[PDB]
Amino acid sequence: GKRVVIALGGNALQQRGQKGSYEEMMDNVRKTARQIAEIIARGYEVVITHGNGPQVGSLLLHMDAGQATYGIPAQPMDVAGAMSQGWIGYMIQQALKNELRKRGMEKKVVTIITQTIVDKNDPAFQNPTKPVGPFYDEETAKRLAREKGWIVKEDSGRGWRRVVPSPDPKGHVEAETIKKLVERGVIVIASGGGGVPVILEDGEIKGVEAVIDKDLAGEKLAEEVNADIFMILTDVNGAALYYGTEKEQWLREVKVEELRKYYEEGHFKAGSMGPKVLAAIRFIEWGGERAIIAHLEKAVEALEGKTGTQVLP
Amino acid sequence: GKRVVIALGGNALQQRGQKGSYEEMMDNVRKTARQIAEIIARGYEVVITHGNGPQVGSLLLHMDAGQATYGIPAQPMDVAGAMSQGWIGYMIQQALKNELRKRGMEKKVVTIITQTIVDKNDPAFQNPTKPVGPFYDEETAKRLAREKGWIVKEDSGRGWRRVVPSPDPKGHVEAETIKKLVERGVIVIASGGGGVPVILEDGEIKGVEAVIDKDLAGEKLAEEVNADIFMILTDVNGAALYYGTEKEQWLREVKVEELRKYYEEGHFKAGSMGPKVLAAIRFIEWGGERAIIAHLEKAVEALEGKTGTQVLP
Ligand SMILES: Nc1ncnc2c1ncn2[C@@H]1O[C@H](COP(=O)(O)OP(=O)(O)O)[C@@H](O)[C@H]1O
Ligand SMILES: Nc1ncnc2c1ncn2[C@@H]1O[C@H](COP(=O)(O)OP(=O)(O)O)[C@@H](O)[C@H]1O
Ligand SMILES: [Mg+2]
Ligand SMILES: [Mg+2]
Known about the structure:
The structure is a homodimer. The first copy, chain A, has helices at 22-41, 53-70, 77-102, 138-148, 175-183, 214-224, 256-265, 273-286, 299-303, and strands spanning 3-7, 45-49, 109-111, 115-117, 130-131, 151-154, 160-164, 171-172, 187-189, 196-201, 204-207, 229-234, 240-241, 249-250, 253-255, 290-295, 309-312. By secondary structure, chain A is an alpha/beta fold. Chain A has a single domain (1-313), classed as Acetylglutamate kinase-like (Carbamate kinase, 3-Layer(aba) Sandwich), CATH 3.40.1160. The longest helix of chain A has 26 residues, at 77-102. The radius of gyration of chain A is 19 Å and the shape is globular. At the A-B interface, α2, α3, α5 and β11 of A face α2, α3, α5 and β11 of B. One magnesium ion binds at residues 9, 272 of chain A. Chains A, B: Its EC number is 2.7.2.2.
């Protein structure tokens, strides 16, 4: 069967308005796992990645409160991303191996903790723009800046929050092992959250506090495993021109040259759809057969080419 | 080369007195990685596990403070164990691959998120007695007992705590994939903290809230990967008879028949050295060639048979 990387998004774990309690996440993950299980029953070789923004944000909230109440040290963002990969990957590997056993299918399903390499001279480290963590007042946010070297900015009028770098993913430290597992039929969950951001210097891989886009990092995983198809599943069913306006037009089959023109026109917003269109464009430019942007609830119909945005060479 | 499962303990990550800051843990994991890289330079096939008691403890304190301050949901103990495997695995896989890379050894090092199967009829579930989490007052602890189904007890005069089961590990969900990676020469970190505790019910894997002893779970990982040697690294250089008294004798080479008799005499305290000697006894009874209990800082000499307790058939 064809090999597909499926990059899950927020809605695989949390619905609009949910705080992300354990029971909420267990229900959303089981719904996700039935869609993936359908795709595995159809014969596809599946590799899974996902986001972690709300989950790393909850861990940063928790550790700021722990440090204030019990005096125990808060851990840095690379550690919070590794914690998130163990959390989310445990819930997806247990629900997907259980839904495949319910279908009379025995498969091996594992999470591999993944480090994503970026260039230490990436220009994003000179200009951090992604807001993250708790909302602080001005006084606490500027004291944290002085003491820790953080950058802060007032965020949409809700308080002050750290801003961190969003560097471009170059590749994964564990790519060789990830591909070996895929080639032997294991369903691997990797690059969770975009992976832990790391740079290489003086022999050592070292964590850095940043966010890597999970669709851009997912596209690099798709190159690394030699995937045929790269599919992004989100909470809208594709990419639209003139989104939210009276001229709104949902893209269906679109050639990559046309999608690149649409991209420079600005239709795909930078905090959201822009990087998913960029990742689909890059996968086609690398040589992939098809990239897809669709809604999680239409994963299977999308994968067959019937709905969603379908990007071709 | 001989295949060895190395079961690290507290001192691989924290020393006496430390709270467990990132910088403390990064320094202790670097020291651990220099020991293991020398073993790998010597041609052994290594598999690594470790404990997670202080690190799941910190996460339970952080999430009770987070839910109390920000109203975000705390997650249950199986999820906190998964978070701990991601956090500790990422640090050891980064440090160990860095020491191998600087010494001119290119080796793959990865953490697999591991679930440890226990028997749902284990008598431990009828008698929980390991205290975990924050110290509460009696009202708060008995309200949580009513609302959540917890068992609480007053712990050593410091307040009331939840008590959980400590079931015997039977095997690991991921054992076949772990062993296939070891046979391909990947250095695997697995069963961290004893693994996420899970039962099997009607074919479905379900998490439970419990602690699984990391040395007993380490010995079952050694059975599953067909290890030759099982080596526990701790903060004392072996097991002693009549520990702390005038009759004290530190065991060097010991045969399993004698060591079972000493175990029955009660020399090895149940919350510390007892499970280490039980796990060494079990590895020799399963058919292993040698089980070792030694100090972390003397790991190479101990694997060579020159120091520490050396348990033989
Ligand atoms: N041109 C566009 N077409 C479609 N959706 C768009 C567009 N521009 C912005 N969006 C937003 O992109 C959002 C999906 O991205 P995002 O919220 O980051 O989700 P995920 O967690 O799946 O990555 C949609 O809910 C939509 O509101
Ligand atoms: N018979 C004994 N021989 C040696 N050490 C013992 C014995 N009984 C108890 N101990 C204690 O076991 C401790 C090591 O176990 P533990 O503290 O649980 O460490 P780890 O984190 O490595 O599992 C030693 O520091 C020692 O105080
Ligand atoms: Mg997004
Ligand atoms: Mg111990």
